[PDB]
PDB file of all heavy atoms in Angstrom:
ATOM      1  N   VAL G  95      57.149 -11.705 137.306  1.00104.11           N
ATOM      2  CA  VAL G  95      58.421 -12.187 137.828  1.00104.11           C
ATOM      3  C   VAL G  95      58.197 -13.041 139.071  1.00104.11           C
ATOM      4  O   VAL G  95      58.980 -13.955 139.350  1.00104.11           O
ATOM      5  CB  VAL G  95      59.388 -11.014 138.095  1.00104.11           C
ATOM      6  CG1 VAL G  95      58.869 -10.108 139.194  1.00104.11           C
ATOM      7  CG2 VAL G  95      60.783 -11.531 138.427  1.00104.11           C
ATOM      8  N   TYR G  96      57.117 -12.792 139.820  1.00104.28           N
ATOM      9  CA  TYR G  96      56.842 -13.618 140.992  1.00104.28           C
ATOM     10  C   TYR G  96      56.522 -15.057 140.598  1.00104.28           C
ATOM     11  O   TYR G  96      57.051 -16.001 141.197  1.00104.28           O
ATOM     12  CB  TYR G  96      55.694 -13.023 141.805  1.00104.28           C
ATOM     13  CG  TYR G  96      54.936 -14.057 142.606  1.00104.28           C
ATOM     14  CD1 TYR G  96      55.479 -14.592 143.768  1.00104.28           C
ATOM     15  CD2 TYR G  96      53.682 -14.496 142.205  1.00104.28           C
ATOM     16  CE1 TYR G  96      54.796 -15.539 144.504  1.00104.28           C
ATOM     17  CE2 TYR G  96      52.991 -15.443 142.936  1.00104.28           C
ATOM     18  CZ  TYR G  96      53.553 -15.961 144.084  1.00104.28           C
ATOM     19  OH  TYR G  96      52.868 -16.902 144.818  1.00104.28           O
ATOM     20  N   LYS G  97      55.649 -15.249 139.605  1.00105.13           N
ATOM     21  CA  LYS G  97      55.355 -16.613 139.171  1.00105.13           C
ATOM     22  C   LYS G  97      56.527 -17.215 138.407  1.00105.13           C
ATOM     23  O   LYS G  97      56.669 -18.442 138.347  1.00105.13           O
ATOM     24  CB  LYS G  97      54.078 -16.688 138.328  1.00105.13           C
ATOM     25  CG  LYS G  97      52.945 -15.758 138.717  1.00105.13           C
ATOM     26  CD  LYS G  97      51.830 -15.836 137.676  1.00105.13           C
ATOM     27  CE  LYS G  97      52.009 -14.852 136.535  1.00105.13           C
ATOM     28  NZ  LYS G  97      52.097 -13.455 137.019  1.00105.13           N
ATOM     29  N   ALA G  98      57.374 -16.377 137.803  1.00101.68           N
ATOM     30  CA  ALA G  98      58.613 -16.897 137.237  1.00101.68           C
ATOM     31  C   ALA G  98      59.519 -17.453 138.330  1.00101.68           C
ATOM     32  O   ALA G  98      60.151 -18.502 138.155  1.00101.68           O
ATOM     33  CB  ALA G  98      59.330 -15.805 136.445  1.00101.68           C
ATOM     34  N   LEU G  99      59.592 -16.760 139.468  1.00102.60           N
ATOM     35  CA  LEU G  99      60.479 -17.171 140.551  1.00102.60           C
ATOM     36  C   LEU G  99      59.917 -18.340 141.347  1.00102.60           C
ATOM     37  O   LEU G  99      60.687 -19.144 141.883  1.00102.60           O
ATOM     38  CB  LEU G  99      60.745 -15.991 141.481  1.00102.60           C
ATOM     39  CG  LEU G  99      61.678 -14.909 140.946  1.00102.60           C
ATOM     40  CD1 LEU G  99      61.662 -13.719 141.880  1.00102.60           C
ATOM     41  CD2 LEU G  99      63.088 -15.448 140.780  1.00102.60           C
ATOM     42  N   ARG G 100      58.590 -18.451 141.448  1.00104.94           N
ATOM     43  CA  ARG G 100      58.001 -19.470 142.311  1.00104.94           C
ATOM     44  C   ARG G 100      58.321 -20.888 141.858  1.00104.94           C
ATOM     45  O   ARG G 100      58.134 -21.825 142.641  1.00104.94           O
ATOM     46  CB  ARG G 100      56.485 -19.290 142.394  1.00104.94           C
ATOM     47  CG  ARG G 100      55.743 -19.650 141.122  1.00104.94           C
ATOM     48  CD  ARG G 100      54.235 -19.706 141.340  1.00104.94           C
ATOM     49  NE  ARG G 100      53.843 -20.741 142.289  1.00104.94           N
ATOM     50  CZ  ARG G 100      53.593 -20.527 143.574  1.00104.94           C
ATOM     51  NH1 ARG G 100      53.675 -19.317 144.103  1.00104.94           N
ATOM     52  NH2 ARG G 100      53.251 -21.554 144.348  1.00104.94           N
ATOM     53  N   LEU G 101      58.791 -21.068 140.627  1.00104.79           N
ATOM     54  CA  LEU G 101      59.209 -22.369 140.127  1.00104.79           C
ATOM     55  C   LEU G 101      60.677 -22.660 140.410  1.00104.79           C
ATOM     56  O   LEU G 101      61.214 -23.640 139.882  1.00104.79           O
ATOM     57  CB  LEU G 101      58.941 -22.464 138.623  1.00104.79           C
ATOM     58  CG  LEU G 101      57.639 -21.831 138.128  1.00104.79           C
ATOM     59  CD1 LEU G 101      57.586 -21.836 136.610  1.00104.79           C
ATOM     60  CD2 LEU G 101      56.437 -22.554 138.713  1.00104.79           C
ATOM     61  N   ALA G 102      61.338 -21.827 141.214  1.00105.59           N
ATOM     62  CA  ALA G 102      62.753 -22.044 141.512  1.00105.59           C
ATOM     63  C   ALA G 102      63.027 -23.380 142.193  1.00105.59           C
ATOM     64  O   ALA G 102      63.965 -24.076 141.766  1.00105.59           O
ATOM     65  CB  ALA G 102      63.292 -20.875 142.346  1.00105.59           C
ATOM     66  N   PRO G 103      62.296 -23.796 143.237  1.00105.84           N
ATOM     67  CA  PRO G 103      62.588 -25.112 143.833  1.00105.84           C
ATOM     68  C   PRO G 103      62.418 -26.262 142.859  1.00105.84           C
ATOM     69  O   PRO G 103      63.153 -27.256 142.955  1.00105.84           O
ATOM     70  CB  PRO G 103      61.589 -25.203 144.994  1.00105.84           C
ATOM     71  CG  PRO G 103      61.221 -23.796 145.293  1.00105.84           C
ATOM     72  CD  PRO G 103      61.216 -23.109 143.968  1.00105.84           C
ATOM     73  N   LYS G 104      61.481 -26.143 141.914  1.00106.65           N
ATOM     74  CA  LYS G 104      61.210 -27.184 140.930  1.00106.65           C
ATOM     75  C   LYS G 104      62.510 -27.541 140.226  1.00106.65           C
ATOM     76  O   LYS G 104      63.031 -28.654 140.369  1.00106.65           O
ATOM     77  CB  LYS G 104      60.202 -26.697 139.883  1.00106.65           C
ATOM     78  CG  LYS G 104      58.815 -26.259 140.366  1.00106.65           C
ATOM     79  CD  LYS G 104      57.906 -27.372 140.854  1.00106.65           C
ATOM     80  CE  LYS G 104      57.999 -27.559 142.357  1.00106.65           C
ATOM     81  NZ  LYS G 104      57.019 -28.572 142.819  1.00106.65           N
ATOM     82  N   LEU G 105      63.049 -26.566 139.491  1.00107.01           N
ATOM     83  CA  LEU G 105      64.292 -26.764 138.758  1.00107.01           C
ATOM     84  C   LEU G 105      65.461 -27.024 139.697  1.00107.01           C
ATOM     85  O   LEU G 105      66.345 -27.825 139.376  1.00107.01           O
ATOM     86  CB  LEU G 105      64.582 -25.546 137.879  1.00107.01           C
ATOM     87  CG  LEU G 105      63.776 -25.350 136.590  1.00107.01           C
ATOM     88  CD1 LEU G 105      62.340 -24.933 136.873  1.00107.01           C
ATOM     89  CD2 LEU G 105      64.455 -24.322 135.704  1.00107.01           C
ATOM     90  N   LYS G 106      65.474 -26.371 140.863  1.00110.23           N
ATOM     91  CA  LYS G 106      66.605 -26.498 141.776  1.00110.23           C
ATOM     92  C   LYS G 106      66.800 -27.940 142.223  1.00110.23           C
ATOM     93  O   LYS G 106      67.935 -28.428 142.284  1.00110.23           O
ATOM     94  CB  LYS G 106      66.404 -25.585 142.985  1.00110.23           C
ATOM     95  CG  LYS G 106      67.100 -24.239 142.870  1.00110.23           C
ATOM     96  CD  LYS G 106      67.107 -23.504 144.200  1.00110.23           C
ATOM     97  CE  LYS G 106      67.852 -24.292 145.264  1.00110.23           C
ATOM     98  NZ  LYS G 106      69.115 -24.881 144.738  1.00110.23           N
TER      99      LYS G 106
END
Side-chain angles (χ1 to χ4, degrees):
Chain G
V95 65
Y96 153 75
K97 324 173 271 303
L99 286 171
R100 71 169 297 98
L101 321 173
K104 300 289 94 175
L105 285 72
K106 264 192 61 43

